[PDB]
Design an enzyme around this catalytic site. Structure first.
Site, mmCIF file in Angstrom:
data_model
loop_
_atom_site.group_PDB
_atom_site.id
_atom_site.type_symbol
_atom_site.label_atom_id
_atom_site.label_comp_id
_atom_site.label_asym_id
_atom_site.label_seq_id
_atom_site.Cartn_x
_atom_site.Cartn_y
_atom_site.Cartn_z
ATOM 1 N N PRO A 141 1.126 -1.411 -0.212
ATOM 2 C CA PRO A 141 0.145 -0.267 -0.304
ATOM 3 C C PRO A 141 0.926 1.256 0.412
ATOM 4 O O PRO A 141 2.231 1.450 0.622
ATOM 5 C CB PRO A 141 -1.017 -0.488 1.201
ATOM 6 N N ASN A 160 -8.065 10.554 -1.091
ATOM 7 C CA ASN A 160 -9.275 9.464 -2.262
ATOM 8 C C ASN A 160 -8.437 8.324 -1.816
ATOM 9 O O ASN A 160 -7.139 7.233 -1.800
ATOM 10 C CB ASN A 160 -8.219 9.832 -3.613
#
EC number: 5.3.2.1
Lengths: 114, 114, 114
Positions: free
Chosen positions: A1, A97
């Site tokens: 990530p 986002n």
């Protein structure tokens, strides 16, 4: 990530240990090992949120899965909480986002994760 | 909505008032309240367009809806016009990526917009 | 195509000619005319990869088409190779997000590509 935070908060206001704390908390939230978590903080930015320049943050989280309605709400509570506690940014002046990446669309180590 | 412009134009060349102008013009263009518009300008960047270091910009507009073929054409005329007039960037050296975000994939205020 | 690299490598360690080399090699890899290639390098960043502040890079490639499993593997070998050779970044400390943009969602020259 991969987690990125862009903020108008000055560099000297980013506390020691912040990048490790982000790394640790994201490893736990996403379930991915900390060796795979990347974090990036960009202070001193020229930004406004809702027409004003009080502290704010524009952020993104890209992950190969572990993105969805309930998960994203949990990430937002976690990340807004860290930005409030550590950077003194109001949660209502943070946008994050979320991006669910396909493995074939993430490059790493001369190839992709496919 | 969130509008980001990254440019090699120097910071001193960014007019006072530019973030406020962007905010107001984007509120009008998107139809969204100014309170929800976030703007971020990043000058002094190491970038090239077509192999040239003449003034250029790389930008993005993320919005929950209000993104589409005709709308994006309109946004492009507006935003290239502002970059030309205020930053002296030729429209043919601007890219703007448009992103229609799902509400569940935008964090804000300890939760998401879903 | 738009290629962005964010790195903790310092500005002085970015060699002269790097943007031009990226432009040339991306034009060849993607098939796209050099005029349509934009490149952006952001050194001196506050970032970690796997919890570690050793040299790393977080990157993206947006393109209208020319994105896919085999293509992205090829881009990753190219780009990790350049980051290793020129910036001394280990390939296993690089992430590249690949994004296939719709022509209607890319603004340029007062309009879009659609």
């Amino acid at each position: 990530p991969m987690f990125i935070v862009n903020t108008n908060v000055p560099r000297a206001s980013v506390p020691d240990g912040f990048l490790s704390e982000l790394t640790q908390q994201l490893a736990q939230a996403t379930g991915k090992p900390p060796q795979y978590i990347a974090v990036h903080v960009v202070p001193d930015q020229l930004m406004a949120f809702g027409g004003s320049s009080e502290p704010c943050a524009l952020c993104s989280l890209h992950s190969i899965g572990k993105i969805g309605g309930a998960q994203n709400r949990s990430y937002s509570k976690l990340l807004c909480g860290l930005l409030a506690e550590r950077l003194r940014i109001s949660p209502d002046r943070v946008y994050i986002n979320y991006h669910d990446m396909n493995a074939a669309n993430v490059g790493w180590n001369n190839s992709t994760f496919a």
